[PDB]
Amino acid sequence: GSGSSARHMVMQKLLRKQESTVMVLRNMVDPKDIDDDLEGEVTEECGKFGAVNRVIIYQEKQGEEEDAEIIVKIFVEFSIASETHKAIQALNGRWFAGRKVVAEVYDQERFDNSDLSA
């Protein structure tokens, strides 16, 4: 036709999506060498990408044993999604002090339910 549906923004109010603003940063930290001020350090560093609402550092057990492996997962919630993705693109697949890190978007609902397992 003439693109009429787009031109009149037909049904646009139904089609809005909420975007996650949460980044998960993986493999950044050895679990045996965790800075006391890690949360603050991450907070300040991430200010190079956007307004940071909060940071949670989570030491995740990989099993139930007393000696189960620990993996450090760093969550950063930014004010807006464009900031989250700026941070992800600056970090993901890159090396820091001999560690190759993974940075990805994390589901907002899971984060807001304190489900830090993914």
Q: What is the widest separation between alpha-carbon atoms in the chain?
A: 66
Site string for Cl ion, 59-98 (x = CB under 5 A): --------------------------x--x----------
Residue number, 72 or 91, with CB nearest to Cl ion = 91
The amino acid sitting at 112 is D
Residue number, 73 or 85, with CB nearest to Cl ion = 85
Q: How far is the CB of 49 from Cl ion (least distance, A)?
A: 12
SS3 93: coil
Residue number, 71 or 105, with CB nearest to Cl ion = 105
Nearest to 35 by CA among 67, 77, 9, 74: 74
Task: Tell me the two tokens of residue 9.
Answer: 């923004």
Chain contacts with Cl ion (rule: CB under 5 A): 85, 88
